Structure 1
Amino acid sequence: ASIFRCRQCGQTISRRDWLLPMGGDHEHVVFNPAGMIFRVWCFSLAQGLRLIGAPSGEFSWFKGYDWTIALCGQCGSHLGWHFEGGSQPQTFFGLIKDRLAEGPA
Structure 2
Amino acid sequence: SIFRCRQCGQTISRRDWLLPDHEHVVFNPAGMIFRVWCFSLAQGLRLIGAPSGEFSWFKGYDWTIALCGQCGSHLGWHYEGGSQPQTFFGLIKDRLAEG
Q: Normalising by the residue count of structure 2, what TM-score does the alignment of the two structures yield?
A: 1.00
Q: Give the deviation of 1:38 after TM superposition.
A: 0.2
The counterpart of 2:50, out of the listed 38, 49, 54, is 54
Structure 1 residue ranges (4+ consecutive) displaced by more than 6 angstroms after TM superposition = none
RMSD of aligned alpha carbons: 0.2
Q: Give the deviation of 1:17 after TM superposition.
A: 0.1
The CA deviation string for residues 35-66 of structure 1, in whole angstroms up to 9 with x for no partner, is: 00000000000000000111000000000000
SS in 1 for 2:94: helix
Unaligned runs of 5+ in 1: none
Q: Aligned partners of 2:30 and 2:61: how far apart in 1?
A: 20
Aligned residues: 99
Q: Aligned partners of 1:55 and 1:11: how far apart in 2?
A: 24
SS in 2 for 1:71: strand
Q: Aligned partners of 1:67 and 1:36: how far apart in 2?
A: 17
Q: Give the deviation of 1:34 after TM superposition.
A: 0.2
Identity of aligned residues (%): 99
Q: Aligned partners of 1:57 and 1:100: how far apart in 2?
A: 25
Equivalent residue, structure 1, for 2:4: 5
Q: Normalising by the residue count of structure 1, what TM-score does the alignment of the two structures yield?
A: 0.94
Q: Give the deviation of 1:9 after TM superposition.
A: 0.1
Q: Give the deviation of 1:6 after TM superposition.
A: 0.1
Q: Give the deviation of 1:33 after TM superposition.
A: 0.2
Q: Aligned partners of 2:31 and 2:50: how far apart in 1?
A: 23
Q: Give the deviation of 1:91 after TM superposition.
A: 0.2
SS in 2 for 1:61: coil
